[PDB]
Structures are given as structure tokens and as C-alpha cells.
Design a protein around this nucleic acid. Structure first.
Ligand code: MG
Ligand code: MG
Ligand code: MG
Ligand code: MG
Ligand code: MG
Ligand code: MG
Ligand code: MG
Ligand code: MG
Ligand code: MG
Length: 205
RNA sequence: AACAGAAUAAGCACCGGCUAACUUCGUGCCAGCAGCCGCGGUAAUACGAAGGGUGCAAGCGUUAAUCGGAAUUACUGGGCGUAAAGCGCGCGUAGGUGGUUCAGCAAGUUGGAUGUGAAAUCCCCGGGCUCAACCUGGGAACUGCAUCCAAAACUACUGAGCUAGAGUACGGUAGAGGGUGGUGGAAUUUCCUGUGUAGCGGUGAAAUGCGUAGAUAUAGGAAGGAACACCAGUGGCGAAGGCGACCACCUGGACUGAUACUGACACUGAGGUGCGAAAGCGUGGGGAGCAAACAGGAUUAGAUACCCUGGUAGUCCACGCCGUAAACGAUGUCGACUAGCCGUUGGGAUCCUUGAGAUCUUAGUGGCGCAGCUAACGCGAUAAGUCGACCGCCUGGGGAGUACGGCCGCAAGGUUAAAACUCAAAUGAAUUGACGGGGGCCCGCACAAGCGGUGGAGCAUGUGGUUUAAUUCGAAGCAACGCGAAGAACCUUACCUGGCCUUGACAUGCUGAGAACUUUCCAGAGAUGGAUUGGUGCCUUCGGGAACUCAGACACAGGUGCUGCAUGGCUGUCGUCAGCUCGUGUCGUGAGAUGUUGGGUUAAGUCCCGUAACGAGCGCAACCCUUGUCCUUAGUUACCAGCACCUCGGGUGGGCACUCUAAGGAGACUGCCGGUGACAAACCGGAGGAAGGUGGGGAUGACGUCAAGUCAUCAUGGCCCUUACGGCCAGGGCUACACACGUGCUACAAUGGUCGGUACAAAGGGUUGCCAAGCCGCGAGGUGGAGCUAAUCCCAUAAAACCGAUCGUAGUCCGGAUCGCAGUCUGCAACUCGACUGCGUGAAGUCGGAAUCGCUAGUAAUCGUGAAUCAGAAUGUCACGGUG
């Protein structure tokens, strides 16, 4: 059922989030670094929303480009968090670490940034649909050509597992030529676990 | 009037919907609640409490009892085609209603006057008690009944007329309208007679039956009984039931024309009177076929039934009875108005006349249709439309058209016709689905063609069952059982038996202690306990800090414990099936519907032509990968055509032709030819071409379904354990074992079996590894250490095929299970419990029931090779090639 919309297009649309060659004797000693970096960084940057954390390995050290749509929260008073983490990313990843920060201008057209706001609204006890009818039209005044948002879970009920489904525009999924974003962020309410899926469709080719 | 002092004085029901007003806590299909809907199975806004809140107040609630709401007994104010409801049809008494002109009358009717309709009560305007209830003055009202006066439209009564309703007299047609006799022809059966000789008859198929004691067939004859082909029709006639041979005989009514007469003589009809299909009943006839009851055969778990062979009352006639039917147009009779068109019976017209004529008009009988009505379906001059006159009948479902009583009947029975009790529903028309042993088109190894297996035997593997101290859980039709598990000697591992811990194996905070480290030691199955040379760091505001390790105490830690029906995540399934929806618009009272149907076509909701719909999305197609052709760029470790070289090995120099490798491109679009279609999609052929009509394969699975599976991968709501349901360590266990089922491998031999030679692959792994040459071993191997970080080195010898030999179809020079003995390898350790090797022994098995599965071409069938997991261990899983 609906094979993951990145794993079919690694190639014709998108590329990896981490590029580095490794021998067969060190391949599984760089993965375990790069997988507990991403669990570390998102638990620290719970605010100052983060979409993508890329990692390059040049000759013998590192490079990391953390993407936020609000860089001023992370770079606060000239890198009081930047040099503080750069001391302490080396303690998990023994090479010296670079940290680079870009902007995510138009923050309402990347799926991770959108779906983090859905968990925020649905844990403030906002209505399950008034939160989302406004979170699609706002992401259609500027930008995209199609948006699907599925909201599944407890949805407040007693024994209820309904799925909200609202769509606008055009979203293909069996065209490999197209360009689709995808993100699943969850939510822990005072009862039940709500999972949210987002399918922002940018332009094709 | 004075004194005292805020002192002397607030409950009751309810809070899920109707219905104003809400959340926590107990409880868990228990107790309990309730005016109806109905709540309660472990999170209850409905039960019990607690806060809060709403209604009313000196009262608030329940029960009982009437009228409202109830247009639910409908006078004002309902109904009867299908929801309950039109008698089976006539005739007719009492009664109800009355066409049209005058004239009279005044019984109804209207207007007025008088007498009355007790007072109170109700209503209106006032007046008294500090207000109000309460008391009270004046008026209206009491709808009525009676007596007088007047008016005269309508009804009644009376008197006279009129002909439009109704009836009579006269021509004239059409008819299965009745009753009483008579007479036919075809066919069936029984009987007689001739010829002739082996079956007839029956049915999914048979059997009972009938036959040489001469059947069926076939010809001749006789007797008898009932029905009346073709004409024959939405056709006729009758009050309805009903009525079909031809003729005579009596006999009723309808149509149509002309003309005179009577002058309202009419309509309906409670009671009462008649005619009442068929089955049945009584007495007498009559007995061809058909046929309940019955008998036998068959089918059948069973078959009184369907089907088969027989067969009686009855059906037929006369006379008498019974009175019901889906007695149907599910529609009482009678009268008047309201657009059309196409039929048909019979009858007059007019009309040019030859008509296969024309138009108009009545009496019937059919098909469509506008207004209109209808819940809808549907009726629509033969109303269910608009209106009149009289009658019958209906009041939720069962109980029940039933019981008692009455009247009729020879009998069966019929007609008239209740109640108690019990339920919150019974029923109507129309929608979307689902389903059919209903119909129409289409597709799939779905059948049919073909090859090969499963179930027979042996071993391998899983589940059920059994058993044990534990055989740790989970997955139960296809969708399950070589399944999580891509590896159980211990470890894994959860379970069992013990040994052993309590802030803990681990997290953070607190208090002390020492750097960490190294201790090379004993006890003990180990866990652990105690020795134990040593070590004394590290940054120093030199104060210490941080680092680690030990103890104390608190919050806690931890959980493979329950819930997959509290859920997220991730996968199966229908199904790679061709569908699934929306916007705006119009139709419908509404749930809906249309687009998305029709014709053609397609692997396809793919296209074309059509069309109250016009569009859009998801899907299909393409975009991606791989294989097949060629071109360009590229030449080491790959490559050898040309060149020498050679020791004859691309060995070497060399070459960039090639094969190969991998980058980037072209090629295929029904493009072109012909035919075919509406010439429009497309379809059938044809050329060229490496490839021809989506070239072959792969990934890609729509809206959804099954509360499908998983809390034991992980994440989480709740619930329990927290001196153990948590931790630690030994051995055991999951591999036990009369049995049954699932997949899988070998075999059962001569398209074979051995021995000796000899030929050709792809794909992949390897510096914590591959482990060569030499070397020693019957053999698995042991030495030995190269080469190697990979087109180089190693894994690494492909097997079937071919060639020669023997083997002669024998449970075997077949088959290899079992088992004895002897070895090597990994690992601390091969007892329960590993894999291989040697030697010996040699089983079942001679192609395998009912059944049942896979496959349409490099495919089935058969032969090998590699990888993942991995110290060791594949008949499985995944993957690549031979022969075909
Ligand atoms: Mg007081
Ligand atoms: Mg309560
Ligand atoms: Mg009433
Ligand atoms: Mg009458
Ligand atoms: Mg009075
Ligand atoms: Mg009838
Ligand atoms: Mg009737
Ligand atoms: Mg459809
Ligand atoms: Mg292995």
C-alpha cells in the first residue's frame, strides 16, 4: 500500500541527505554516528523548526548544514548555541564538526515544517478540522499546486479511528517525473497517539 | 402609639434527547434506573455520591381521575385503485332528493312587538376591606319557547300549463342471450375378423406393466360415450356468474332512422324478494376419456411428494339442495361540463365518383396524451379531473371473521358477531446496494486441449495431539502449517530446578569515600566472598575542581505482565482488477438521479460518433530500470586482426582493428502499402527492418473492505507487579513421541548403472580475511606459507553432453534408511544435541486409491554454481547459468 514517495524517486527527482564514500571496514562505523546525530539534534531543536540535516564527509573530518526557517533563534547573539554545540557534537562524533545554517524562506512549502505545526495545534485542544482547513489554504495562497493532508488516530472519540482526508489541487503519485515532499510527525495528546501525513506537491519535472 | 434588637423565621425536585441547566469519583451485563426512546460487559455528562447549575417557593414532588394536544367518531373539520375500508349482482316497499312557465297561499324563512327564560355564577362599568382574594350596586347575556304584525326571493302545499327528462306506437339491422327436441364428421377406447412375427410402452436413465395362450403395427366391421378443430379477433351478447357444431321450435333485451302521441309519469333504496362459477349433498339414470382417495415401480439420509404404470368417487343427464371465491376494473348506481391523435365492432349521414373513397355524428370496445389530481406508482370523455342526489362501509397489530347466543341447512357449514390478554409496532408506494439453480454481452491455465507431480514407501521440516519439572509465547478456510527464525551444544532464552541479590544491571538529583588502574591468590558448580606486589594521575584562584570507583538514604529504576475491539506505525487481502468521486447546472415534495448512459472499439471509464449536462481530480497510458541493433568518447589488470619476437605461453615488444567494459546517443511512431469501418476511431493482411503493432521482463497496486494480523521490532492511553511478575549464575529444556495433516527431497532402474579418458558457463565473495605451489594422509585433511586489498591473487575442479569398456532388466553391480566400528574440524566444552570421512551391514520400495495442484516458450522438465545469516551447521530462502 503506497510505497514511500522518496524511496521510489532517489534519482530522477531527489537525492540523498548524506553523501560520503566508505570502505567495507568502516561503512557501519559512520552510520551509527550519523543516526544518533539526527536523534540528538531534533531533541535539542524542538523549537526553531528544522526540516533537513545534511551531512557531507570531506577529507577526514565533517560538514553539517542544519536548515531552519528561523536562524536567529539558533544563532543567538553571534553563535552562543553554534560554538556550544560544536564543542559537543565532537563528543558523539570524534571528528571536528562544521555547522552551517541556511534559511527556509517560504516555510509553508516544506512538509516537515508544516506537520510540526499540526502537532502543536492538536495538542492545544484545537478542533481537528479548523486547524487544518486553515493550514492548507495558507499553504495555497503562496506556492504549491496540490496538497493532501491525512489526519488519523484517536481524534478525540471513545473507540474511534477515523481518518480526515482533505485535499486541494492536483497530486500525482504514480509519476516518477514529479517532485513530491513527504513527512510524518506524530502527536501525543492526553489520550491516544495521532499521526499526521503530508504530501506537498511542488512543480513537476 | 411606645419599647427590645438583625435578633424570631428555607427548603424541594431535576440536570442523555423531547426540556431550562455538568463535570469529576465509586460501580463494572453486578447492583440498580425509567413518561417514552432505552442506558450498565472496566475511562458511565442516564445507576450511587461530590462540587456546580437551572426551575419553582411556604411549599415542592409522585400516584389516581376528567377535558385538551387527538382533523384519533371529523356538524363546524377526515376517508374507501394498491396502506384498514365499495355488499357477488339485480328488482323494489318505508324513507331521502325534484326539469320548466304563471297564479294563489304563508306551513318553513327573515324583520319587529309582547309574555317568559328564579336569584346566584360567568362577562362589562363602577363602589367598599391599607392592596388583593372577598363583598357589593347598574347593565348585557341566558342562544330558548309561545302569542301577534308585516314582507314573498327560495323550499313546501294548492290551481293551471310547457316539452328539453322518461315511456309508447313505426320501419330497420347485429348477436356463443335463454329453453325444448333433432342430426352430423374427425379422433379415443372396448369387441369381432384377416394378414403378419418379436418385442411394445415408458423415462435424466431405468423399473412396475403388456407380449408367440400371437402384442404393437395393419385392414374390415359393430357398439357406445362426452366434447365441438380451422373460422376466432384488445370480436360479440348478457344485470352479474356465464355463453362457441348445424336446423327447426318457442322467447327476452339492445341499437338506428323517420314521425305522431302521453306531459315530469324521474332518481336511489334500510329492511324484504330473486338469479347464485366450481367442489360438495339427496333419489334415479348413464360409464368413452380424464382422474383426488388408493396400489406398485423409481428417486431419495428419509419422500406421505414431484416423475412412471394402473385406478374409484366424481366430471355427463333429469329433479331438489347448498350459497360462498383473487365472485377483480382489488374502482356502488345515476346525471352534467372539460385539449388532442391512432385503432376497431354496427348504424345512419353528407360527398366529386372510380374508390384500396372522404369528412362528420351517435352506441360500444382498445393504445398514447395536456390541464388537472395523487404519498408515489399511475388514471386522464370507459377519470382516480371539476360538481350534484341517495346508499354501503373503515378506526393500530395479534387475539379473530374466531368463541358463545340467534336464524337458516339433511349434512358439510354459512350468516350476525365480542371480550380478557399481549406487543410498540403492523402495512403502502418508491430509492441506493447486495443477492438469483432470471435474462443479455465480455474476460481469465476457468474448462477443453498437452506435459508433469501430490495422496504409496523412505528420510527432511512445520503444525495438531500426547506427555513432562518446563516442552516459553504469537500466526487458524482460500489470506496457516520450510510460518516470525537470514542458523536453539551453552550463549541466544523469554520457560523449568536451584544457588543469590534489594535505590538495584542501568537514569537523574543527595551524603561520604578514594585517581583511574594493576593485582597475576585461595575458597566455592559458578554467582560471589576475601586476600592482592603494585598505581597515585589529571586542570590547578593551589583553595580545590572535574574525572572515574565504593557505601548510605529518598524520589525512583525496571517489566518479553493484560488490552491489535483504546490507538499510531508497518504489511497481507480482494486485484494490477478497471474502476471510484467532486464542482457548477437542470429534473424530483424527498432519499436519489444525471454526467459515468447509446452505437462502434479497446489489454483499459482506452478512444470515436452521439447526447441536459459542461468540466476537473484519482486511476489506466507514458515518465524509471533491464535485455536485444547501431553510432560516438575511452584502452589497463581487459583485447590479439596486422607486425616482429619467442622458450611457442599475448610469453614479449607492440597495436587501438576487435571482443569486452560503461558513459552518452539514435531506432518503432500503425510510420508506410493494400483492403476493410460512418472512411472514425480502429481492424485484417503487406513491404522494409536487429526488433511490428503496449518487442520480452521488473518496480509502480485507486476510493475501500475484512474492528484481518502484530502491545513480542519499535512508539503510546490505561491497568496491575515494585523484598519481585524485577535482577544474577550454574545444569535442564524448546531437538520428548502409539498417532493424524501440510509442504519438500531422493528413489523404485537398461532414454539406465559403473570404470577409464575428455568439452564448453554465468554470477558472486575475500587485509580481523582468501588461505595457493610443494608436502604428508584409504579419505575427510595436516603441514607449508605465497600472492592479495583486487577485471591482477585466491575462492574455483561447473555438471548434464560426448568416447571406450563392462552391466542383461535380477529386489538387481537397483536403492540407499537403519546400525556396529574407526577417524578428522570448529569450539572452554560434540552425553542428552553438530557436520563430514573410512570400513561393514543392508531394509521399505517393482510408478503409487478416491481425489488434486502447477505451467502457454528460453516456458515446463532435468543438471550444476554462488551469496546472505554464520566459530561450527541447508533437502529451505534468495540469486546465475547449461540442455531444452
Ligand atoms: Mg435572622
Ligand atoms: Mg446521576
Ligand atoms: Mg376532537
Ligand atoms: Mg331500486
Ligand atoms: Mg338569572
Ligand atoms: Mg370473474
Ligand atoms: Mg371486494
Ligand atoms: Mg461507475
Ligand atoms: Mg556458515
Amino acid at each position: 500500500q503506497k510505497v514511500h514517495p522518496n524511496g521510489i524517486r532517489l534519482g530522477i527527482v531527489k537525492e540523498h541527505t548524506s553523501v560520503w564514500y566508505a570502505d567495507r571496514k568502516n561503512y557501519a562505523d559512520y552510520l551509527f554516528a550519523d543516526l544518533k546525530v539526527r536523534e540528538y539534534l531534533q531533541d535539542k531543536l524542538k523549537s526553531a523548526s528544522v526540516s533537513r540535516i545534511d551531512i557531507h564527509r570531506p577529507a577526514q573530518t565533517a560538514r553539517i548544514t542544519i536548515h531552519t526557517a528561523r536562524p536567529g533563534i539558533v544563532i543567538g547573539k553571534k553563535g552562543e548555541d553554534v560554538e556550544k554545540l560544536r564543542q559537543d557534537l565532537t563528543k558523539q562524533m570524534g571528528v571536528p564538526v562544521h555547522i552551517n545554517i541556511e534559511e527556509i524562506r517560504k516555510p509553508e512549502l516544506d512538509a516537515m515544517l508544516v506537520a510540526q505545526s499540526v502537532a502543536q495545534q492538536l495538542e492545544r485542544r484545537v478542533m481537528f478540522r479548523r486547524a487544518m482547513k486553515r493550514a492548507v489554504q495558507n499553504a495555497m495562497r503562496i506556492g504549491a499546486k496540490g496538497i493532501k493532508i491525512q489526519v488519523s488516530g484517536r481524534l478525540g472519540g471513545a473507540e474511534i479511528a477515523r481518518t480526515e482526508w482533505y485535499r486541494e489541487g492536483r497530486v500525482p503519485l504514480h509519476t516518477l517525473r514529479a517532485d513530491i515532499d513527504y513527512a510524518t510527525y506524530e502527536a501525543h495528546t492526553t489520550y491516544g497517539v495521532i499521526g499526521v501525513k503530508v504530501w506537498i506537491f511542488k512543480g513537476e519535472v
